[PDB]
Design a protein around this ligand. Structure first.
Ligand SMILES: Cc1cc2nc3c(=O)[nH]c(=O)nc-3n(C[C@H](O)[C@H](O)[C@H](O)COP(=O)(O)OP(=O)(O)OC[C@H]3O[C@@H](n4cnc5c(N)ncnc54)[C@H](O)[C@@H]3O)c2cc1C
Length: 335
């Protein structure tokens, strides 16, 4: 037929990024986006948005580092472009502190992020309960702004957004050629894999524009991130908690920790708490599965289980997923 009919389930940041890379990799494409919840309210919108490579347990550290590099150098061109307002990608400076001096003070992502260095004595004076610190400048992406921009790009490519429920993948078989699974935590029901589980995270969005440097205490328990609209203050990592009701004691402990780290936070307004379910998987599922039970073929390339560090690597993972897509499309062309 000389045309390929693609499909991407998932409206998260990676669900759209994958279709972007597919539209710019595969020669002949007709990729569509099909998800229950789109860019107004996805788990990628509630996300803080800082580009800090959280260490994946089950992925090669050089592969993960390269993913962060490929993502960073794309967002870095975005921040220097004219569309940085609409795409919502801005350079954010700040510091990563530590309770005790680590054995090695250089991570695997020092030479990619801008100007990795140590905190001076005068900089260590800003935090009395802390011995060692690091200083650097990264990029933060606003989800309620970045994801709509990706939508406006894929619309130019030729895709469209359908809002329907997909209980099982076989609904796409009698029409679509290949399916791209980017449903995130939802894929637990889609692909049946039980490895992915939800890590609950609650963040208080407070408004205080004087804060302009981010502050992360190394532990995931305390992060203070500046935002273009709401300063994002959070440190909750409950595991297996599907509960999306904002619990109050978390809003107490997060505020106490973050207020201790940055004191000027005392005079702040509009302390509105939201929650989210990180789709956690030891290794981000990125492989081509060919499921077909007493029927015709159905190639499905999986792409989920991003965890707490999926945004900082969403472009590299998109590249690898589009690689599998191109390989399988070639397998369909040639016999
Ligand atoms: C509070 C919080 C803070 C975070 N902070 C950071 C951070 O600073 N840095 C970082 O790198 N990462 C961070 N993350 C992680 C990051 O937000 C996610 O891991 C990642 O964006 C999710 O990738 P995804 O697009 O596959 O999943 P999602 O964003 O959840 O996208 C999945 C989408 O697929 C669709 N879908 C789902 N199920 C179905 C179904 N059954 N049928 C049809 N469509 C379906 C829906 O539209 C859904 O929104 C954070 C996460 C949370 C919760």
């Amino acid at each position: 037929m000389d045309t390929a009919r693609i499909a991407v389930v998932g409206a998260g940041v990676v669900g759209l990024s994958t279709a972007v890379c597919i539209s710019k990799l595969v020669p002949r494409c007709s990729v569509t986006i099909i998800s229950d919840k789109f860019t107004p309210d996805t788990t990628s919108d509630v996300a803080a948005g800082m580009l800090i490579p959280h260490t994946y347990p089950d992925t090669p550290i050089h592969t993960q580092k390269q993913w962060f590099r490929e993502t960073f150098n794309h967002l870095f061109a975005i921040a220097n472009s004219a569309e940085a307002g609409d795409a919502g990608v801005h350079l954010v400076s700040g510091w990563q502190i530590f309770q005790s001096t680590p054995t090695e003070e250089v991570p695997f992502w020092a030479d990619v992020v801008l100007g990795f260095r140590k905190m001076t004595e005068a900089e260590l004076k800003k935090f009395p309960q802390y011995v060692f610190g690091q200083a650097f400048t990264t990029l933060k992406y606003e989800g309620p702004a970045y994801l709509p921009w990706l939508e406006k790009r894929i619309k130019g490519s030729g895709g469209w957004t359908l809002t329907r429920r997909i209980e099982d993948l076989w609904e796409l078989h009698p029409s679509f050629d290949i399916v791209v699974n980017c449903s995130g935590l939802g894929s637990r029901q889609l692909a049946g894999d039980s490895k992915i589980f939800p890590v609950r995270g609650q963040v208080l969005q407070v408004q205080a524009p004087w804060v302009e440097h981010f502050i992360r205490d190394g532990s995931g328990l305390t992060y203070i991130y500046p935002g273009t609209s709401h300063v994002t203050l959070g440190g909750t990592r409950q595991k297996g908690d599907w509960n999306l009701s904002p619990d109050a004691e978390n809003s107490r402990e997060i505020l106490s920790r973050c207020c201790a780290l940055e004191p000027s936070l005392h005079g702040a307004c509009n302390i509105r708490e939201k929650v989210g379910l990180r789709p956690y998987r030891p290794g981000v599922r990125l492989q081509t599965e060919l499921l077909a039970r007493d029927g015709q073929r159905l190639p499905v390339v999986h792409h989920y289980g991003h965890g707490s560090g999926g945004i900082s690597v969403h472009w590299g993972t998109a590249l690898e997923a589009a690689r599998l897509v191109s390989e399988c499309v070639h397998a369909l062309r040639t016999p």
